[PDB]
């Protein structure tokens, strides 16, 4: 049923998954020197391309390919519209490897036809807590703890084949070539997410959304006026009253994050992310890059009291194209990013997130039920959305875990 994924070092079924007890590689250990020097063979009308992410035109080419051809909802009503500034941020973290951004162009005119991006991530991905308990009970502790150390691996995102080239098996060829380029750098594992079901996820979570401007959301058919609001004399006034928020944060102490905060935010974030089975480890440079405010892209606020940062939250912006509405061109969405709470209940900290997002003109706040995102869904009036985000590894056996044991946010 999978002419491509059946050939790859991933668990092939849920049964295989269910019998995985330790973290570790799937494949033959291999070396750099084993790997073909030369790009994978490709049709004489296409050519491989490595975009220069410090070239504005290169970024623009990737931007237009994703604007017109990237992920849509199931009813083709919305399509993500990652900005150019966002793409430069996401694609170029500290020590990114340029060669890991892989494109296919049509030779004759250098039209970008497909793209995939890899970036470095340092990931904790050793045997999960519940399986370590089972390993104690079997006398198998050392084997379970073998791959406990964070690993420098590849995080894959932005896979996209132009709509005119769909279903010609181009995606596999892009994935093989990305894989070659990563392996040539002595990296052998990757982490990626998808909303489609592939062999075989290690975790799956629902999406959630929190309405900020319900009048717009209804107008674009992101949201409906729900049936129960009809027994009401006036639906929309009631919907707006339901989702109203204060004008200003409620936490005294809350301000935008500045560069001097990097050390304290690193410390509180890393302490927090330890409570999860799979999670990123960030250097001060990585914290600076991913969390310092960037206009239009990422927004981060800390709670500081008595000159100490105690809590913080972050969200990033991705607008979506609204396919064919005469009043609105764009859905202006905020996505919950990393956070850490030490002084206040997480629901009180995230409420300030919603208040800030709302004041700054966002229409909705979205998220996946990773991290402790469930502890605030009901109080903060998040609703479950359609479908699920699945998490996967390339070349890594991993027991199934709950998405509340997953601490990697994927942009």
Among 71, 165, 171, 330, binds ligand CWZ (CB under 6 A): 71
Nearest by Cα to 301 from 343, 247, 345, 261: 261
Rounded to the nearest whole angstrom, what is the least distance from the CB of residue 378 to ligand MYA in the complex? 29
Query: Cα 151 from chain centroid?
Result: 18
Count CA within 13 A, CB hemisphere, residue 367: 29
3 annotated to a ligand binding site? yes
Nearest by Cα to 407 from 294, 271, 210: 271
Contact 79, 72 (CB under 8 A): yes
346 annotated to a ligand binding site? no
Q: Which residues ranging from 175 to 214 are in contact with ligand MYA (CB under 6 A)? A: 175, 178-179, 182, 187-190, 192, 194, 196, 198
Per CB under 6 A, does 320 bind ligand CWZ?
yes
5 annotated to a ligand binding site? yes
| C-alpha–C-alpha distance, residues 129 and 204, integer Å | 18
Q: Which residues ranging from 158 to 197 are in contact with ligand CWZ (CB under 6 A)? A: 193-195
Rounded to the nearest whole angstrom, what is the least distance from the CB of residue 118 to Mg ion in the complex? 19
Among 16, 47, 72, 284, binds ligand CWZ (CB under 6 A): 72
Rounded to the nearest whole angstrom, what is the least distance from the CB of residue 249 to ligand CWZ in the complex? 23
Among 121, 125, 160, 291, binds ligand MYA (CB under 6 A): 160
319 membership: H or E segment, kind and range: strand 308-322
Q: Which two tokens stand for residue 141?
A: 């502790």
The residue at minimum Cβ distance from ligand MYA is: 2
Per CB under 6 A, does 4 bind ligand MYA?
yes
User: Catalytic annotation on 408?
Assistant: no
| C-alpha–C-alpha distance, residues 228 and 231, integer Å | 6
Contacts of 164 (CB under 8 A, 6+ apart): none
Please, which residue, 251 or 366, has the CB nearer to ligand CWZ? 366
- Choosing from 123, 174, 380, 411, which is the catalytic residue? 411
Per CB under 6 A, does 219 bind ligand CWZ?
no
Residue with tokens 């990305």: 178
237 membership: H or E segment, kind and range: helix 235-243
How many other CB atoms are found less than 10 A from the CB of residue 318? 18
CA separation (Å) from 396 to 11, 40, 142, 150, 337?
8, 23, 18, 14, 25
Query: Count residues contacting ligand CWZ (CB under 6 A)?
Result: 20
Per CB under 6 A, does 73 bind ligand CWZ?
yes
13 annotated to a ligand binding site? no
Residues found near ligand MYA in the complex (CB under 6 A): 2-5, 69-71, 154, 156-161, 166-172, 175, 178-179, 182, 187-190, 192, 194, 196, 198, 394-395
Residues found near ligand CWZ in the complex (CB under 6 A): 71-73, 78-80, 193-195, 207-209, 320, 331, 333, 335, 366-368, 385
Q: Mind telling me the catalytic residues?
A: 411
């Amino acid at each position: 049923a999978h002419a491509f994924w059946s050939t790859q070092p991933v668990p092939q079924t849920e049964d295989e998954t269910e019998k995985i007890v330790f973290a570790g590689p799937m494949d033959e250990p291999k070396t750099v020197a084993d790997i073909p020097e030369e790009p994978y063979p490709i049709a004489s009308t296409f050519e491989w391309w490595t975009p220069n992410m410090e070239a504005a035109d290169d970024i623009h080419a990737i931007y237009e390919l994703l604007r017109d051809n990237y992920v849509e909802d199931d009813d083709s009503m919305f399509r993500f519209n990652y900005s150019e500034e966002f793409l430069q941020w996401a694609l170029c973290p500290p020590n990114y490897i340029p060669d890991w951004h892989v494109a296919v162009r049509r030779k004759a005119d250098k039209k970008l036809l497909a793209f995939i991006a890899g970036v470095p991530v340092t990931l904790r991905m050793g045997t999960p807590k519940y399986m370590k308990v089972k390993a104690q009970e079997k006398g198998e502790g050392e084997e379970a703890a073998k791959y406990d150390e964070p690993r420098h691996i590849c995080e894959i995102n932005f896979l996209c084949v132009h709509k005119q080239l769909r279903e010609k098996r181009l995606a596999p060829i892009l994935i093989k070539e990305a894989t070659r380029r990563v392996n040539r750098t002595n990296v052998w594992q990757a982490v990626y997410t998808a909303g489609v079901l592939l062999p075989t996820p290690y975790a799956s979570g629902q999406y959630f959304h929190r309405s900020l401007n319900p009048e717009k959301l209804v107008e674009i058919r992101f949201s409906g006026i729900p049936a129960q609001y009809q027994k009401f004399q006036n639906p929309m006034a009631m919907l707006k009253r339901n989702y109203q928020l204060p004008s200003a944060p409620k936490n005294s102490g809350l301000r935008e994050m500045k560069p001097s905060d990097v050390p304290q935010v690193r410390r509180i974030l890393m302490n927090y992310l330890d409570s999860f089975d799979v999670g990123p480890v960030f250097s001060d440079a990585e914290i600076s890059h991913y969390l310092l405010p960037r206009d239009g892209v990422v927004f981060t606020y800390v709670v500081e009291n008595d000159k100490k940062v105690t809590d913080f939250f972050s969200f990033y912006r991705i607008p979506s194209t609204v396919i064919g509405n005469s009043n609105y061109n764009l859905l202006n969405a905020a996505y919950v990013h990393y956070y850490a709470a030490t002084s206040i209940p997480l629901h009180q900290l995230i409420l300030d997130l919603l208040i800030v997002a709302h004041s700054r003109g966002f229409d909705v706040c979205n998220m996946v039920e990773i991290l402790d995102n469930r502890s605030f869904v009901e109080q903060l009036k998040f609703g479950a959305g359609d479908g699920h985000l699945r998490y996967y590894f390339y070349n890594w056996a991993y027991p199934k875990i709950k998405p509340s044991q997953v601490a990697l946010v994927m942009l």
